[PDB]
Amino acid sequence: VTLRAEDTSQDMYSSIDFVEEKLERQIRKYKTRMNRKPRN
RNA sequence: GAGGGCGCUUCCUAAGGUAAGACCGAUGACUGGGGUGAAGUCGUAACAAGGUAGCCGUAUCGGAAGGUGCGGCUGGAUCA
Numbered sequence: 394v395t396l397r398a399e400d401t402s403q404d405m406y407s408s409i410d411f412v413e414e415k416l417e418r419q420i421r422k423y424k425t426r427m428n429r430k431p432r433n
Numbered sequence: 434g435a436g437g438g439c440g441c442u443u444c445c446u447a448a449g450g451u452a453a454g455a456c457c458g459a460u461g462a463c464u465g466g467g468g469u470g471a472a473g474u475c476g477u478a479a480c481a482a483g484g485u486a487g488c489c490g491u492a493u494c495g496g497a498a499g500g501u502g503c504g505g506c507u508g509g510a511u512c513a
Contacts, residue, residue: 402472410472421477425484432484 394423 398416402408425432 404472407472414472417476422484424477429484 394427 396419398412398419400408400412400415402411
């Protein structure tokens with residue numbers, strides 16, 4: 394898979410914070426999108 | 434002689450002490466919860482049949498979201 398992340402906050406430190414946490418929650422979205430190649 | 438102040442004790446008796454509380458405030462080592470703020474860190478849950486739909490009352494096991502089970506209802510689905 395390929396997935397980029399050009400996102401924002403007010404602070405660049407807060408963009409590193411909330412956007413890399415957004416990468417964590419993206420992999421949380423990518424659990425069944427990765428692991429569950431069976432949906433049944 | 435009567436009566437009279439004083440003569441003359443007591444009654445109630447103001448205050449002070451006692452004891453055994455109760456009330457109410459202040460106060461307090463450490464400590465339980467809650468709210469606020471970071472943007473640490475743990476996590477996939479709750480949201481779509483939101484990734485095991487849940488949601489209750491209840492018992493019980495988790496660091497924690499939570500789980501297991503008793504029974505009930507859609508404020509639930511593909512449509513059963």
